[PDB]
């Protein structure tokens, strides 16, 4: 008869005692059990074809994607403990900066810059949310999926901060159009068209490997450097201590996404040919990111400098991954 | 070997029962009874076990053989108690 183990049978002989993270996250997807018929139905259904083409047939390869491990080892339980603390901080900032009338002290010029450059990001942030939730459903391992899961929740977090602040700004400056105009700015303003073209096209890159690359490796670093880093620094220098601190807080989530993305690339580089596959996707998408950064930052004060810094910092993210 | 699904009278479930193409309905019923009689169905010494096509209810002669029954593989057959 079979004797009981001290851990899950798939983790047996793991050497060291399995952590809570490994216990709850590993080897959970079952659609990868039968590559020729992932789902328990007719093998010709559209979804069968979708996973075979965009998951199984991807040019990013490994023999054991399930070996991937999130460097932050995020679990649901710890994700909520972490973010509940971070939200207590952000909520406190909102509450107390409101108490001292922070918004009433902004210059008219800065308020107009916010209407153009800031509020409309609720569209870009939600697009990132959709972008990462797609990675969630097409990745080949549960440990990879979870990272995308929490990343998606973070994107919704930014969207939410943005929605909240848009309301406060509208209340303080009802004539600016905060809350009403964002869609028209996102759709029409030349400052946003680079980012809009980039994310719209990236949202239809179905291959899990290309989605990971287009979203995580190319688009997010460009959005983060432009909207959080550059706009955030500008905010501070313009007297908007709130946006300056908010952007820095959201950057913490972005740093975490870069950490797991970096670990996945590191694992992919264990196999010959993946470096080239990834660099090929980066060369395809990078030009749209440059375009996004250029159109957005050039419209900001001292744009030429902001552009160089954003281009430099975003590229550095990938350079340090090899 | 020919597979058929056995729906034994008074039983609660239909079962897979492999038979032979040269088997007689009586011999088919014998193979089916093996999986039902004395397992979850009481014997009926008086009665005689008969085989009928489940779909349309066609009653097959005790002596007819599987090969001439014009069954489809996996065909469901009712094994009933009769006089």
């Amino acid at each position: 008869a079979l004797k009981p183990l001290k851990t899950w049978s798939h983790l047996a002989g793991n050497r060291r005692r399995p952590s809570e993270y490994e216990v709850v996250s590993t080897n959970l997807h079952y659609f990868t059990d039968n590559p020729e018929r992932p789902w328990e139905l007719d093998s010709n259904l559209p979804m069968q074809t979708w996973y075979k083409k965009y998951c199984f047939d991807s040019p990013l390869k490994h023999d054991d994607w399930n070996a991937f491990r999130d460097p932050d080892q995020l679990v649901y339980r710890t994700y909520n403990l972490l973010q509940d603390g971070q939200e207590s901080y952000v909520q406190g900032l909102f509450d107390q900066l409101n108490d001292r009338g922070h918004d009433q002290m902004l210059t008219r010029e800065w308020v107009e810059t916010l209407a153009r450059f800031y509020t409309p990001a609720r569209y870009l942030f939600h697009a990132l949310q959709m972008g990462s939730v797609y990675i969630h459903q097409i990745a080949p391992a549960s440990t990879i999926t979870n990272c995308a899961t929490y990343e998606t929740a973070d994107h919704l977090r930014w969207l939410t901060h943005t929605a909240y602040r848009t309301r406060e700004l509208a209340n303080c400056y009802p004539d600016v159009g905060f809350g009403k105009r964002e869609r028209d700015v996102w759709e029409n303003d030349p400052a946003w068209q680079g980012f809009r073209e980039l994310i719209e096209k990236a949202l239809i890159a179905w291959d899990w490997g290309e989605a990971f690359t287009a979203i995580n490796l190319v688009t997010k670093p460009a959005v983060e450097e432009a909207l959080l880093q550059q706009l955030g620094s500008l905010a501070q220098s313009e007297g908007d201590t709130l946006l300056g601190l908010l952007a820095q807080a959201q950057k913490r989530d972005a740093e975490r996404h870069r950490r797991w993305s970096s670990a996945l690339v590191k694992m992919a580089l264990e196999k010959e040919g993946n470096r080239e596959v990834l660099q090929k996707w980066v060369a395809k998408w990078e030009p749209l990111a440059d375009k996004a950064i250029e159109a957005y930052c050039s419209a900001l004060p001292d744009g030429e400098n902001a552009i160089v810094e954003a281009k430099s910092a975003s590229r550095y993210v990938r350079q340090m991954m090899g | 070997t020919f597979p058929i699904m056995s729906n034994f009278e008074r039983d609660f479930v239909i079962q897979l029962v492999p038979v032979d193409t040269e088997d007689t309905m009586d011999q088919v019923a014998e193979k089916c009874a093996y999986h039902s009689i004395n397992r979850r169905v009481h014997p009926q010494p008086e009665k005689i076990l008969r085989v009928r096509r489940h779909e349309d209810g066609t009653l097959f002669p005790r002596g007819m053989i599987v090969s001439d029954a014009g069954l489809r593989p996996t065909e469901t057959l009712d094994i009933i108690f009769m006089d």
Partner: protein
């Protein structure tokens, strides 16, 4: 100061825009979106009734886990699981093996809506729903993991869905059909409305009640806590259904509801029915599986369908009658073929239990009791070899469950066969065959356990071979829960 939620909530869901660099159809592919010709503007009428924002979510969910994990740690060294009733133990092992990884898979079904739903409010609620199922999958691995050293059966909390054991195939058949291979809108309807709102939301309530009654406070708190997350995301189907009805798609909506409710019912008849009427100790039975279904499930569906402007499914009457039988057959099937499952089925046919069964189901002893009479005599007369099978039962090509029904004095076992393109399919009911006929290409070349056995895919081609094919070995293979203790009541 802080704003009230109502003052800014809508901005969180004002996220649709008009694509320019890609087409709307490329961005929201029909096979994934299921917008069904209904415009983006019209889908924007979607309005979830139970609203929640990110900060409220992490705060509230943080406290839920603090509580559940605290209860677990405080009762862990008490070793309740070592002195719990065998029927209760088997109930949990069955629960975890069937559910754990399907809960996790549900996070992908939610993710399907989070990306592809054209309704903004649907995309955000699905993001929270995605997080909820992530929690459900993780916590339902974490809790049973505490018992891996007690029995290999607990390892199936992880393993089950990775095997070809018949029950697991039935589980994937249902879940993959309902939530993994359907467009966004179909998922909100079939999973969220039909299954979660209609079945599990109330069931988990009863399960948590039974756990408390059994003295298992750890499991009681677990299920109880998970249950509270359900409403938050189970709500998603309603609004979708109203949108489809408001426009010209009521029949399409009705057909999805009919299918989903039937498939949910069949899975339920095997995973819950047997447990309520046989595994739970007689003294701890508040009501019968049938009473539970009528009071808590059937009434609610009629209520819901009425308010949405939908009808009762065509099979409603048959469904009503089947409440007397179906689960009794699934229980007998599971117990007889016990060695084919990863938990120990409890016979539940002692004299006391049989009189209760007669009360709740007049005619039980004349029908179901007949089979159990033969089984008992054999056990009394030392012929246990006749209480285990030597062949495979006929499997339904839709629900992948055994085709079983009323035996004995009211014998009424039927097979709703269907020949389609040269192949003969078997169905355990009229509705099961119907599910196949309204969309044959979705099921066509799938093969159930029997089909595979007959095709030669199970080798060696015998029971011992079928057992290895299902990853079952001594130690996990099931047997009678109370080790035939109940037989002594008959000598």
């Amino acid at each position: 100061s802080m704003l009230k939620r109502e003052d800014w909530y809508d901005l969180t869901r004002t996220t649709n825009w008009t694509p320019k660099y890609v087409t709307e159809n490329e961005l929201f592919p029909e096979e994934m979106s299921g917008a069904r010709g209904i415009s983006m503007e019209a889908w924007e009428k979607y309005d979830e009734p139970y609203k929640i924002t990110y900060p409220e979510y992490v705060s509230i969910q943080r406290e839920k886990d603090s509580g559940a994990y605290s209860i677990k740690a405080a009762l862990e060294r008490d070793g309740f699981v070592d002195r719990a009733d065998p029927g209760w133990v088997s109930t949990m092992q069955l629960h975890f093996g069937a559910i754990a990884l399907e809960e996790y898979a549900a996070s992908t079904a939610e993710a399907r809506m989070a990306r592809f739903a054209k309704a903004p409010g649907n995309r955000n609620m699905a993001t929270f729903g995605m997080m909820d199922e992530n929690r459900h999958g993780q916590i339902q691995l974490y809790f049973p993991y505490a018992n891996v050293k007690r029995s290999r059966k607990w390892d199936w909390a992880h393993k089950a869905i990775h095997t070809n054991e018949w029950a697991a195939i039935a589980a994937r058949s249902f879940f993959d059909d309902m939530m993994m291979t359907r467009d966004s809108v179909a998922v909100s309807i079939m999973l969220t409305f039909a299954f979660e709102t209609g079945f599990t939301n109330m069931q988990f309530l009863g399960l948590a009640a039974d756990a408390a009654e059994a003295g298992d406070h750890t499991f009681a708190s677990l299920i109880s806590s998970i249950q509270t997350d359900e409403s938050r995301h189970a709500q998603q189907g309603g609004p979708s259904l109203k949108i489809l009805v408001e426009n010209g798609k009521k029949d399409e909506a009705q057909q999805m509801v009919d299918v989903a409710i039937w498939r949910s019912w069949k899975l339920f008849s095997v995973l819950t029915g047997p447990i309520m009427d046989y595994y739970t100790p007689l003294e701890s039975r508040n009501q019968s599986f049938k009473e539970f279904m009528l009071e808590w499930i059937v009434a609610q569906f009629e209520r819901q369908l009425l308010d949405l402007g939908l009808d009762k499914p065509w099979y409603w009457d048959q469904f009503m009658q089947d409440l007397d039988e179906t689960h009794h057959g699934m229980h007998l099937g599971v117990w007889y073929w016990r060695p084919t499952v990863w938990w120990d089925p409890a016979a539940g046919v002692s004299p006391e239990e049989r009189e209760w069964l007669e009360e709740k189901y007049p005619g039980w002893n004349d029908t179901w009791g007949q089979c159990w009479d033969v089984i008992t005599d054999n056990l009394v007369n030392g012929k246990p070899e006749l209480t285990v099978p030597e062949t495979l039962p006929t499997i339904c090509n839709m629900c992948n469950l055994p085709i079983a029904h009323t035996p004995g004095n009211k014998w009424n076992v039927k097979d709703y066969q269907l020949e389609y393109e040269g192949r003969l399919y078997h169905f355990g009911s009229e509705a099961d065959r119907w599910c196949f006929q309204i969309d044959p290409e979705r099921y066509k070349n799938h093969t159930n356990l029997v089909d595979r056995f007959l095709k030669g895919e199970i080798q060696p081609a015998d029971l011992a071979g079928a057992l290895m094919y299902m990853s079952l070995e001594p130690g996990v293979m099931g047997d009678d829960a109370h080790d035939y203790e109940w037989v002594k009541a008959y000598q």
